[PDB]
Enzyme design. Structure first.
Site, PDB file in Angstrom:
ATOM      1  N   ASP A   1       0.816  -1.130   0.118  1.00 36.00           N
ATOM      2  CA  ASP A   1      -0.008   0.065  -0.128  1.00 36.00           C
ATOM      3  C   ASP A   1       0.915   1.286   0.180  1.00 36.00           C
ATOM      4  OD1 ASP A   1      -2.620   1.139   0.539  1.00 36.00           O
ATOM      5  OD2 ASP A   1      -2.115   1.462   2.839  1.00 36.00           O
TER       6      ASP A   1
ATOM      7  N   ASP B   1      -0.390   4.911   1.149  1.00 44.12           N
ATOM      8  CA  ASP B   1      -0.756   5.784   2.316  1.00 44.12           C
ATOM      9  C   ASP B   1      -0.361   5.007   3.574  1.00 44.12           C
ATOM     10  OD1 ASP B   1      -1.307   8.041   0.726  1.00 44.12           O
ATOM     11  OD2 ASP B   1      -2.895   7.115  -0.011  1.00 44.12           O
TER      12      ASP B   1
ATOM     13  N   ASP C   1      -1.966  -0.329   6.130  1.00 39.62           N
ATOM     14  CA  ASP C   1      -2.270   0.276   7.264  1.00 39.62           C
ATOM     15  C   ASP C   1      -3.505   0.203   7.953  1.00 39.62           C
ATOM     16  OD1 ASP C   1      -3.208   2.516   5.667  1.00 39.62           O
ATOM     17  OD2 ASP C   1      -2.585   3.920   7.290  1.00 39.62           O
TER      18      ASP C   1
END
Ligand SMILES: O=c1[nH]c(=O)n([C@H]2C[C@H]3O[C@](c4ccccc4)(P(=O)(O)O)OC[C@H]3O2)cc1/C=C/P(=O)(O)O
Ligand SMILES: O=c1[nH]c(=O)n([C@H]2C[C@H]3O[C@](c4ccccc4)(P(=O)(O)O)OC[C@H]3O2)cc1/C=C/P(=O)(O)O
Ligand SMILES: [Mg+2]
Ligand SMILES: [Mg+2]
Lengths: 187, 192
Positions: free
Chosen positions: B7, B9, B142
């Site tokens: 990922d 961000d 996250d």
């Protein structure tokens, strides 16, 4: 549930026609390649074979701002993909590769889908240079081979007919050909 | 061969710090949420709870031109992902979801990767709103749960620690990376 991956260029969006129109518009004196004589996925290479410096002239067309934004839809494509995604137990994703020169390609493709299909299809875009790591039952794409990091992709590649591949495994001749039977064959 | 989906961000790009810097700069009079008090991946909804008019203010920061382009890398992230992709029998893809408001997100994420990681990783971007239809062994992200159309994704989800997810305590059956200095090599090894 059948998952169908649908390519953009040559399947939903008429890249070949747009490239030829843009080329004749910007290079009106130059020889061109009629659509019926197109052979091979890579238009730039056929132009190169016609005459070496036509390679960069034809690249300058598809690298230009607005080029992807302005492509016309493939006949019947938009209706088909709307009908397809409304079928029960059917999921459509728009699975497309950006140019390595991505600057005027990436945002324009999202905007093309938004305008021609709406925000509901914007959510179904997958941008990737490797379609073999995307999971689905079918991939409808106008490229002869679709290659990448999975030696055996999950999907069956259905070749969608375009001027450059017409003269070459299941095929869809057009969106008026019977795509429903192909989907059914996976249910 | 192990495929790792990484990922952007909160894992490569410091979205939370960028959002807070941009909010403090543009809305200096307004109350804010300190990073250590962030809870839940939806920052806008925490701002909304702090005070209703803050929801659109904080959205205006991450919807603005430049926002994604200017994010700072997560410490250690860029070195780790380069090392990871240079390992034999290892493939990295950068697997990220654009905002529904995609206009200043989609191109900016491509340009961020091009500037911070180079053209070789631009080729490895996958943009999708559903990570579950992407095939791989691991997904490092996250967000507490990663959901979509495959009830059973091919990948194992490794939670990467960020201010908004730090308070969660994982069951022993799931795995967390505390930071890029935590032992990501072992996680990859577990799949070889
Ligand atoms: O080099 C090229 N020469 C060329 O004639 N083309 C035509 C053919 C068509 O190819 C594609 C294309 C997509 C990915 C990789 C190569 C080409 P599509 O699969 O979307 O039709 O998009 C760019 C279009 O440009 C593309 C390219 C694109 C090269 P790349 O995308 O940088 O690999
Ligand atoms: O509603 C939101 N509220 C919000 O606070 N955010 C923040 C938090 C985080 O959301 C993400 C996000 C991206 C896609 C889907 C959900 C969230 P990421 O997890 O990728 O960082 O996009 C950037 C960040 O923006 C996004 C959204 C995203 C809304 P949408 O679903 O894209 O319309
Ligand atoms: Mg194509
Ligand atoms: Mg994230």
């Amino acid at each position: 549930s059948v998952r169908v991956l649908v390519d953009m260029d040559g399947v939903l969006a008429d890249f070949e026609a747009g490239l030829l129109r843009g080329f004749r518009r910007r290079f009106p004196e130059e020889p061109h390649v009629p659509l019926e004589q197109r052979r091979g996925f890579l238009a730039r290479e056929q132009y190169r074979a016609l005459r070496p410096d036509l390679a960069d002239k034809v690249a300058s067309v598809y690298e230009a701002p607005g080029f992807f934004l302005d492509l016309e839809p493939i006949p019947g494509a938009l209706d088909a993909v709307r009908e397809m995604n409304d079928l029960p137990d059917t999921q459509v994703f728009i699975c497309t590769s950006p140019l390595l020169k991505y600057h005027h390609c990436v945002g324009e493709k999202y905007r093309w889908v938004e305008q021609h299909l709406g925000p509901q299809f914007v959510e179904r875009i997958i941008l990737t240079r490797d379609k073999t790591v995307v999971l689905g039952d079918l991939l409808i794409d106008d490229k002869d081979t679709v290659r990448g990091q999975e030696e055996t992709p999950s999907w069956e590649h259905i070749l969608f007919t375009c001027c450059h591949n017409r003269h070459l495994r299941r095929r869809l001749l057009s969106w008026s050909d019977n795509w429903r039977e192909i989907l059914d064959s996976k249910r």
